[PDB]
Amino acid sequence: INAQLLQSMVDASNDGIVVAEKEGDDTILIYVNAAFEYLTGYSRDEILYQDCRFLQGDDRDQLGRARIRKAMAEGRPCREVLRNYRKDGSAFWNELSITPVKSDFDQRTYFIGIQEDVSRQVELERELAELRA
Amino acid sequence: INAQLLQSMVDASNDGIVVAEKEGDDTILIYVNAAFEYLTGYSRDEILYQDCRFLQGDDRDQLGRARIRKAMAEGRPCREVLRNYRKDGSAFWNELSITPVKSDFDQRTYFIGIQEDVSRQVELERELAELRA
Numbered sequence A, B: 001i002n003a004q005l006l007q008s009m010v011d012a013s014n015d016g017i018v019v020a021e022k023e024g025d026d027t028i029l030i031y032v033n034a035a036f037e038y039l040t041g042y043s044r045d046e047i048l049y050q051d052c053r054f055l056q057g058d059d060r061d062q063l064g065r066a067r068i069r070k071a072m073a074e075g076r077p078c079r080e081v082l083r084n085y086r087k088d089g090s091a092f093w094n095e096l097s098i099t100p101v102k103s104d105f106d107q108r109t110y111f112i113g114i115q116e117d118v119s120r121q122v123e124l125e126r127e128l129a130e131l132r133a
């Protein structure tokens, strides 16, 4: 499959897709797609080369953080549902998928992130539970 | 971004991703990912070089067909929720996004399809609306 098609497929994805690399305790972003920019509200120039933890804002007491750190250290993919905050400050539920992959071009392991906004389904399920009473 | 990472990003996608080319009134499949292979129940060798309309089965009375057909003619992406049937015969709801992309290698327009399963949400909305009254 051609590389231009793959880049287009990434650029056409509804879910957000990012690529990040490890720099100590930070995993700084090296690629984001348009979907990620519209989901998070930040432009490409602002958040490039930054760890995604800024999406958590002040809600930094989420147990999923430790699970993410364990998964990335051990080279395992992981899936976590987190509360994240856009640039304007509005909250949303982000189903995040992290996948570590070893690039053979430079023998470096990178991390692929897929973000899904699941706020709508969270609200729907909650309302169904309320009506169940 | 290198092609190996792009193929990894596509094969790790939660939604199904496919690539198809135009042959008259048919849009023949040239690529599927693992998620699509396990969602439809068909192997790559079975569905290669065939238009995806077989997923509709006998339920060919879906208006989205017309909308899909017009969208591809004008080179516009489109999003439609359709009824599809697996190889075994079980039914599901597919939110499909079609995006035309210009490949420069051959200056040919290809079509990227992204499929998301919305059956669970469809049932949620059904039950919430029913109990809602």
Ligand SMILES: Cc1cc2nc3c(=O)[nH]c(=O)nc-3n(C[C@H](O)[C@H](O)[C@H](O)COP(=O)(O)O)c2cc1C
Residues within 6 Å of the ligand: A018, A019, A020, A025, A027, A051, A052, A053, A055, A056, A065, A066, A068, A069, A082, A083, A084, A094, A096, A098, A111, A112, A113, A114, A115
């Ligand atoms: C590719 C990638 C994408 C990530 N995307 C998000 C994200 O969208 N939202 C989020 O809250 N954390 C995200 N994270 C996790 C944080 O960036 C961070 O790595 C994790 O919370 C570890 O927490 P710590 O930095 O406090 O140790 C992502 C991590 C990676 C590797």
Ligand SMILES: Cc1cc2nc3c(=O)[nH]c(=O)nc-3n(C[C@H](O)[C@H](O)[C@H](O)COP(=O)(O)O)c2cc1C
Residues within 6 Å of the ligand: B018, B019, B020, B025, B026, B027, B051, B052, B053, B055, B056, B065, B066, B068, B069, B082, B083, B084, B094, B096, B098, B111, B112, B113, B115
């Ligand atoms: C890239 C691509 C992916 C498609 N994926 C699906 C699909 O997953 N399910 C489906 O029912 N139709 C899908 N279609 C639509 C059918 O393949 C077909 O093109 C459509 O029904 C157009 O009208 P026709 O059936 O009269 O030709 C897809 C079309 C394209 C171009």
